[PDB]
């Protein structure tokens, strides 16, 4: 399935994922496509911080869900 990840700069990125993908795996896909290291990445779904060892389906994240990416300040 597809999901969307919105950044504060207003960039929306579209990801190919599986319900069974871990949060860590999603951050690795973001590094793949955008070059942003996982340790700079905070993922939010509907106001909850996603934790690395959990899956998309743990958070009931489905096709065409939007996540929010909060990036560490200044570089990285």
Partner 1 sequence: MANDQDLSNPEYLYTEDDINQLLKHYLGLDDRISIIQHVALNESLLLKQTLHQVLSDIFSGMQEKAVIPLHTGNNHWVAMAIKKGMNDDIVISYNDPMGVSIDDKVTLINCIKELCPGAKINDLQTVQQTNVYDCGPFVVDNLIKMSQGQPILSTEEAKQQAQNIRQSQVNFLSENRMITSAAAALADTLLKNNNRITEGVLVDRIFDNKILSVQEKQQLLNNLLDNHIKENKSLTKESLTRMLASTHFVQQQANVLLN
- Closer Cβ to partner 1, 17 or 38, answer by number: 38
| Out of 1, 45, 55, 58, the residue judged to bind partner 1 by CB under 8 A | 45
- Which residues are near its own copies by CB under 8 A? 39, 62-63, 72
Residue 51 tokens read as: 């934790």
Q: Which residues have CB under 8 Å from 76's CB, separation 6+? A: 36, 37, 40
C-alpha Rg value of the chain to the nearest Å: 11
Nearest approach in angstroms of CB 50 to its own copies is 14
- Closer Cβ to partner 1, 1 or 40, answer by number: 40
- The CA distance from 30 to 14, in Å, is 9
Nearest approach in angstroms of CB 9 to its own copies is 19
């Amino acid at each position: 399935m597809q999901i969307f990840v919105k950044t504060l700069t207003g960039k929306t990125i579209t990801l190919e994922v599986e319900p069974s993908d871990t949060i860590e795996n999603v951050k690795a896909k973001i590094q793949d496509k955008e070059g942003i290291p996982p340790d700079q990445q905070r993922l939010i779904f509907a106001g909850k911080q996603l934790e690395d060892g959990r899956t998309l389906s743990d958070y009931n994240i489905q096709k065409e869900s939007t996540l929010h990416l909060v990036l560490r300040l200044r570089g990285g």
